[PDB]
Chains A and B, each alone.
Chain A
């Protein structure tokens, strides 16, 4: 029934700033029937504001819900790193409940260069006939970081995956894990395995390498 369109889709502010989120309804609804929820990825949503203005228990005074008629806003002032989440608006006055698409807010930080580690495959995995090399980037910011695999100075393409964690709610850093998957045969016919990391926080691209079989 009622459709709630949130704005903006993405949002990034620095600690101490004020973030204004918006929720537009397709029809009119009572301000007494509206809620704002905070959802930190991997956890259940926590109620922020019910009745479009009333703060829930535990929510500090820096959260304020306003608006009426068709437009509602959520103002979060004096931002903290813990406020990283996706925020949703909901209405509970029409026949079906409805939520918004959400607004993902990231809290900014200093430049924070990564901590690059490399892990060669184990003997157990080589026993099965495959090999997976793992490159780790730890506690960096912003999320934009480039990882390139080099096998004997040859740039790998189409044989590696990677995943980034959600922003850490305490220190606002990211972590990336890249996995280069090769067959045992192709892995045994090369020597120098390296991953190269390029980031805003690095003065020069950092390379972490190893030789196959060295001690």
Chain B
């Protein structure tokens, strides 16, 4: 079933992070067979902890676990340089022959801030469908407030703040307009706020 795992990794690049994983009397509290798995945000598993404290022969940086009583904490030191991924814990459970963890996502703080590179596509002729595409990329952290206007005044359902390859984030915004509101109004300006800065891109039927 579920092994409890705490979220909210912390640390100002001090090369140390600690996150627990508590289990039952048949999986964690009474058996020394427990493992973890992080590896990336596009692929989840890689061994990363061979036993309670053992390390596989690829992870030379300080990776270790506690397994004190009915709880298995985790102490990592050398992976404090990248936004890598979530972590998981598992063990041999007599009740159910396997069992996994609730999830602990990780990214390290203190990275240099990056203002976003907002962009926009053309009015996109192709019928009473507009869906204006405003793109946001290369920003940190992943928290921006997007707004739109029609020269003086503001179905939307847009969100996708995932990670990127160059240590940054991304997002998109479409909002599904119609020519009955596109031809009459002069222009539309996609504005983004990242830590209090209005990055604007304006388009018009021209």
A and B: direct contact (Cβ < 8 Å)? no
Residue positions of B touching A, CB distance < 8 A? none
- Interface residues of chain A, those whose CB is within 8 Å of chain B, are none
